[PDB]
Amino acid sequence: MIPTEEALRIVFGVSKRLPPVIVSLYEALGKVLAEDIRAPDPLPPYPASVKDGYAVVASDGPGEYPVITESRAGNDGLGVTVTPGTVAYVTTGGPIPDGADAVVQVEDTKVIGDVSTESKRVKILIQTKKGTDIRRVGCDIEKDATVLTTGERIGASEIGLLATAGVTMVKVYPMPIVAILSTGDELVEPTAGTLGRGQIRDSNRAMLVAAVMQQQCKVVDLGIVRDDRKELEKVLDEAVSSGVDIILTSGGVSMGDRDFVKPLLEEKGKVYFSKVLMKPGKPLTFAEIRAKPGKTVLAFGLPGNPVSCLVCFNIFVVPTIRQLAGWTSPHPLRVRLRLQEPIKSDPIRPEFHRAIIKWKDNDGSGTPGFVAESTGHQMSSRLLSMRSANALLELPATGNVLSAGSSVSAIIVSDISAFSID
């Protein structure tokens, strides 16, 4: 059994970022940029009013003036010069006419005289300062400025910046394509009604398909494979040559006489490890396979026990997906938190204990912080121990009872911005 830290380092060293591709603006969302983005023109590209009001010559000061033009957009006020003793109406974002050097917001003005008469006049009620409420050319974004860089993940504001810069085709790192299969003569499809003797519904495959969908990767569902070496070899050979980047199997990695995942991965590629010092998920197998005349394919022989399967996905597969997708920081978020109840650690293996965590105004020590509740019994066959679990507490192998109020490290495994509040 190699430590988890070493297993993660091995996976990281073998995992390579995928070749970049060109995608459309909305396909770029969630992906990591593979090129810098420079603004082709300034923002604003023209001097723009911050307010609805009047563009003035600041030195004129308070008084009554004729309104010589109106400027809201496009060519409004083109060729008109605001000279001392005149003003122009402007709306927010409107081009400032030549000659005007400040804007007086409409609340500091009063329209004078009958509206019916063509000559519009306005009283400016304050003494403004040059440059007031004007956005000079490029004050928000300078022409040729780098607005986004290589290695930056694209969220909603980054899509907004791409649109600002007129970019609708984007160079990004793609997400890996993942093949998933289940193994076992005891499995039946999850559509089964009454179960026959010695049968269970395949739950890992749908759980892993959902887990991969949450990571925004395309899934190739290869179904249930029986405990037959030739059949599993055929499906693995078909998966490796299909074009996928990652293969996830579950089950068939214990010490049974019909567990063929480990020997087949040894035969097809290079197995870096098959045993990890952790609770749950000891039989985790990792291999690199080269596809026939090519590309490399990463294979995770995940444990069959449902808890172990999902915990290994969260700890080892998620950072691999992110590394392949070009993330510079693929590691999960780790925080420090206080236990709401006592927890016994294992005497030999460090445990990834499932918990429901929340941020509290008082974490028990008189200062705000995260707190955690266990999901109960941690047996690897008990998928209910993963239910609602948004974190894995990292319990060292001391064998002692960690009392309520003691502090531990925890890996956050589900969208921290989707955390239910205290």
Place this chain on the structure above:
Amino acid sequence: MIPTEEALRIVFGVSKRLPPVIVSLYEALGKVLAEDIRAPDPLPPYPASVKDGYAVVASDGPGEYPVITESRAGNDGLGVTVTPGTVAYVTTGGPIPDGADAVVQVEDTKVIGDVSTESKRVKILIQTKKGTDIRRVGCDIEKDATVLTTGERIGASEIGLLATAGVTMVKVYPMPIVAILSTGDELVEPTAGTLGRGQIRDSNRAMLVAAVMQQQCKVVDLGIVRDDRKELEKVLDEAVSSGVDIILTSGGVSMGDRDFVKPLLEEKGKVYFSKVLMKPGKPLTFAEIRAKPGKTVLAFGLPGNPVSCLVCFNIFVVPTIRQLAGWTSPHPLRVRLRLQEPIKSDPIRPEFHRAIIKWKDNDGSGTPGFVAESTGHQMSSRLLSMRSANALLELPATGNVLSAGSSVSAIIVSDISAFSID
């Protein structure tokens, strides 16, 4: 100007959960359950071995015994009784034959005699205890137990539990459908190359489409609408009758003479507010419209300034989407953090200052915690102030300089499990 707390309470009171629908297993991912889920059979449904090894009568103890059957799945060992003085081979998950009451893992056994001879014999090397390494019927899930409840959000483990229970069609609350449009005579499509005088690319629409896609809602893109009252009325009437649940407009809510969003929403429905005491995003308008002979449609007249547009989406629209989608806890995650640099608060309006936050082993006070860096100048026209921003610091309206190391409340606006580590 009403306080943000009051604006949020108004939006919450008007926002109603959508009628539930029936979806397929993979469509249920990310949605909130609208029914409880009970296990139709136990897990395991038969007494199952935890190990690869031999099923024994525990009272026999160490000795040499004939192997009378092999049990891995299905009907293996059906009709065979393990009597005192006999054992049966089992694999993990295999049915325990009748009569056996414990499992001795293969590492505590030794096969005796020539394999060629049909009579297989094994030496049990330890004294086991009744019930060892057996999962009794229902130890993981009892038959008829509630495995998921109404109001629970479906993640990967919950998909795993639905598959365990044989549920492939699920009753859930759906996501709202959102219509989005931009307003302005100064706008051009983001595909525009050289900009004409007084033109800018429409960036809010693509930014909002991306923001809504991140919330997993269907988008109806209604494009750019000019500053013409009749045209905007036609598009709003078309949006309201289309079947969408939420309409998002941006711009056209300032004090200009061609800003028609507020008066049109007043004309079509009930405007609850049009001014909020906050920096940025003061002109935010909220309305409830009833669709023609029906359903209610929520409308947000978002500010045109890009920062204000996105901050209002994050604070007001995201919890509305979640409430409509049946979330019991729609509020965003709020944490407490320390400032990495000084920040000046505004003297009148509480500010939602954009920051890049991270968890540190030392937050500056000698204990672990979140820390924040400002994204720089906070002007509402500067979309670069949203770039990489994963939090909004809630700065009260004191007008004082908050020194580096001081603690503030912060709203987390992007997947906390996608946070780049320190």
